Design an enzyme around this catalytic site. Structure first.
Site, short mmCIF file in Angstrom:
data_model
loop_
_atom_site.label_atom_id
_atom_site.label_comp_id
_atom_site.label_asym_id
_atom_site.label_seq_id
_atom_site.Cartn_x
_atom_site.Cartn_y
_atom_site.Cartn_z
N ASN A 96 0.02 7.82 2.28
CA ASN A 96 0.87 6.88 3.56
C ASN A 96 2.32 7.09 3.69
O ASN A 96 3.03 6.29 4.27
CB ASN A 96 0.50 5.36 3.07
CG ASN A 96 -0.89 5.03 3.33
OD1 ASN A 96 -1.55 5.66 4.23
ND2 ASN A 96 -1.15 3.79 2.48
N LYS A 149 1.77 4.77 -1.15
CA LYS A 149 0.99 5.80 -1.80
C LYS A 149 1.44 7.08 -1.07
O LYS A 149 1.50 7.01 0.24
CB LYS A 149 -0.40 5.63 -1.96
CG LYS A 149 -1.23 5.13 -0.88
CD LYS A 149 -2.67 5.32 -1.04
CE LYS A 149 -3.33 4.84 0.19
NZ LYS A 149 -5.10 4.57 -0.13
N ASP A 185 0.65 -1.23 0.17
CA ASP A 185 -0.06 0.19 -0.10
C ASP A 185 0.87 1.47 0.09
O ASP A 185 0.48 2.10 0.74
CB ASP A 185 -0.91 0.06 1.12
CG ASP A 185 -2.23 0.78 0.95
OD1 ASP A 185 -2.49 1.05 -0.35
OD2 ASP A 185 -2.92 1.47 1.69
N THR A 205 -4.44 0.00 -3.01
CA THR A 205 -4.98 1.11 -3.54
C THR A 205 -5.22 1.15 -5.29
O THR A 205 -4.14 1.10 -5.88
CB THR A 205 -4.53 2.39 -3.31
OG1 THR A 205 -4.46 2.30 -1.71
CG2 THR A 205 -5.24 3.65 -3.59
N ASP A 263 1.67 3.33 7.76
CA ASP A 263 0.51 2.48 7.35
C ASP A 263 0.85 0.98 7.32
O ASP A 263 1.12 0.71 6.00
CB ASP A 263 -0.25 3.12 6.43
CG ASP A 263 -1.66 2.61 6.02
OD1 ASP A 263 -1.95 1.47 6.54
OD2 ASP A 263 -2.46 3.10 5.20
N1 AN2 Z 1 2.57 8.97 13.02
C1 AN2 Z 1 1.78 9.81 12.27
N2 AN2 Z 1 1.79 11.59 12.49
C2 AN2 Z 1 1.00 12.24 11.98
N3 AN2 Z 1 0.01 11.91 11.16
C3 AN2 Z 1 -0.38 10.61 10.85
C4 AN2 Z 1 0.98 9.47 11.66
N4 AN2 Z 1 0.17 8.26 10.90
C5 AN2 Z 1 -0.81 8.61 10.38
N5 AN2 Z 1 -1.16 9.81 10.30
C6 AN2 Z 1 -2.22 10.45 9.37
O1 AN2 Z 1 -3.67 9.54 9.65
C7 AN2 Z 1 -3.62 8.81 8.29
C8 AN2 Z 1 -4.16 7.56 8.38
O2 AN2 Z 1 -3.13 6.75 8.80
P1 AN2 Z 1 -2.81 5.21 8.56
O3 AN2 Z 1 -1.54 4.78 9.42
O4 AN2 Z 1 -2.44 5.10 7.16
O5 AN2 Z 1 -4.19 4.43 8.91
P2 AN2 Z 1 -4.92 3.52 7.78
N6 AN2 Z 1 -4.14 2.08 7.74
O6 AN2 Z 1 -6.39 3.16 8.26
O7 AN2 Z 1 -4.98 3.89 6.50
C9 AN2 Z 1 -2.63 9.25 7.44
O8 AN2 Z 1 -2.73 9.29 6.13
C10 AN2 Z 1 -1.90 10.13 7.98
O9 AN2 Z 1 -2.39 11.59 7.60
MG MG Z 2 -3.40 4.99 5.03
#
Ligand code: AN2
Ligand code: MG
Lengths: 17, 269
Positions: free
Chosen positions: B135, B132, B130, B171, B151
Site C-alpha cells: 500500500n 504495509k 493498513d 492486515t 489505500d
Molecule cells: N495511484 C496508483 N498508481 C499505480 N498503481 C496503483 C495506484 N494505486 C494503487 N495501485 C496499485 O493497485 C493496488 C491496489 O490499490 P489499493 O488502493 O490498495 O486498493 P485496495 N483498498 O483494494 O487495496 C495497489 O497495491 C497498487 O499496486
Molecule cells: Mg491495498
C-alpha cells in the site's frame, strides 16, 4: 523461516460506538 | 452516469486489492495519465458503499506530496471509479523483494517519507489502519524514488489521542497488539505497522511470522520478535532502537510519528 509475502487486507467489522 | 467512459480511456493493469482492480487510464481531453481504481458496485452492501464514499472523503481531506491525490470520483450503474494521480514506480513491496533489503541509508530515507505521510494523516485526524509495503507506492521507479502512501479503504477519523473500538480491520502481519486484543485503539496502530515495515526494510523479512495464524497473533500480542544473527550483526544499535520504540506493545508508551521523525537514525544525517 520468515518470508516477506503479500498479505491480503481484512475487515471483519464489529465497530462499537 | 457515464462520466468516466466518456472522459477516460482505460489502459493496462497496475495492481489489485481485495476488492479493487486498478488500471492506468488517460484523460481523453488532455492526454494526461491517471490510475483508475475500479470497483464493481453490484456486489457491494450498503456498508461497503459507505466505506467507499468514506475513502473518497478522506483522500480529499489529505493534500501532501507523499500521499496519493484523488482527481475524481465517478459512479456508473455497475461500477465506481476513483481516479488518482498515477504513480509508476510500483509498490514498495516489489522493490524490497527485488533488492532483498535496503541499506540503512535507503531504509532511513524510505521510512522517513512513510512517517511524514502518516504523521500528516494523524495531524489531520486520520488513522490509516493498513500500513504495509503493498500500500506504499514509489514515485520515480528505482532509487531515491519518493514514496507515496495509498489505500485509504480502511482509514477513519480520530481526533487527538483518544482511543475507541473502531472494529477489527487491517492486515494480519501488520496488525497491532491492541487491535488483536480487541482493545480501544487509535493513531498509534499506524506506528506499529511502521515498525514492522522498517524491520522488513532492513533485512527483508517480517519480525512476526508463523505458519499458524493463531500463533502469529500470539506473537504479535506478546511483542515477541528478535534480531537474529548474522542478518542484524552489521545493523546499527540505533536503527534497532527506533524499531523497539515503534514495536512497543503498549500504545500509550509507543513512539509517535512526530517523535519518530526526530530519531537519530532518521535525523543523524
Ligand atoms: N495511484 C496508483 N498508481 C499505480 N498503481 C496503483 C495506484 N494505486 C494503487 N495501485 C496499485 O493497485 C493496488 C491496489 O490499490 P489499493 O488502493 O490498495 O486498493 P485496495 N483498498 O483494494 O487495496 C495497489 O497495491 C497498487 O499496486
Ligand atoms: Mg491495498
Amino acid at each position: 523461516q520468515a518470508t516477506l509475502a503479500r498479505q491480503d487486507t481484512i475487515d471483519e467489522g464489529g465497530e462499537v460506538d | 452516469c457515464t462520466r468516466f467512459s466518456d472522459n477516460y480511456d482505460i489502459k493496462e493493469e497496475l495492481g489489485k486489492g481485495a476488492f479493487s482492480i486498478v488500471k492506468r487510464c488517460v484523460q481523453k481531453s488532455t492526454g494526461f495519465e491517471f490510475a483508475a481504481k475500479i470497483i464493481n458496485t453490484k456486489k457491494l452492501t450498503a456498508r461497503d458503499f459507505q466505506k467507499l464514499e468514506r475513502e473518497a472523503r478522506i483522500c480529499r481531506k489529505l493534500h501532501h506530496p507523499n500521499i496519493v491525490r484523488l482527481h475524481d470520483s465517478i459512479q456508473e450503474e455497475n461500477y465506481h471509479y476513483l481516479v488518482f494521480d498515477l504513480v509508476t514506480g510500483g509498490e514498495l513491496f516489489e522493490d524490497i523483494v527485488a533488492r532483498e533489503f535496503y541499506s540503512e541509508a535507503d531504509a532511513s530515507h524510505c521510512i522517513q517519507q512513510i512517517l511524514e505521510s502518516v504523521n500528516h494523516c494523524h495531524q489531520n485526524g486520520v488513522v490509516h489502519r493498513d500500513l504495509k509495503p503493498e500500500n506504499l507506492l514509489l514515485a520515480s521507479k528505482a532509487k531515491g524514488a519518493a514514496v507515496k502512501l495509498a489505500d485509504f479503504g480502511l482509514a477513519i477519523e480520530v481526533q487527538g489521542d483518544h482511543q475507541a473500538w473502531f472494529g477489527f480491520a487491517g492486515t494480519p502481519g501488520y496488525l497491532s497488539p491492541e487491535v488483536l486484543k480487541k482493545e480501544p485503539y487509535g493513531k498509534s496502530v499506524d506506528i506499529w505497522a511502521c515498525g514492522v515495515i522498517l524491520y522488513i526494510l532492513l533485512v527483508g523479512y517480517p519480525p512476526f511470522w508463523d505458519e499458524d495464524q493463531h500463533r502469529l497473533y500470539s506473537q504479535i500480542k506478546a511483542g515477541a520478535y528478535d534480531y537474529p544473527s548474522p542478518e542484524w550483526d552489521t545493523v546499527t544499535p540505533e536503527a534497532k532502537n527506533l524499531i523497539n520504540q515503534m514495536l512497543t506493545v503498549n500504545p500509550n508508551k509507543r513512539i509517535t510519528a512526530a517523535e519518530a521523525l526526530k530519531h537519530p537514525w532518521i535525523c543523524q544525517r
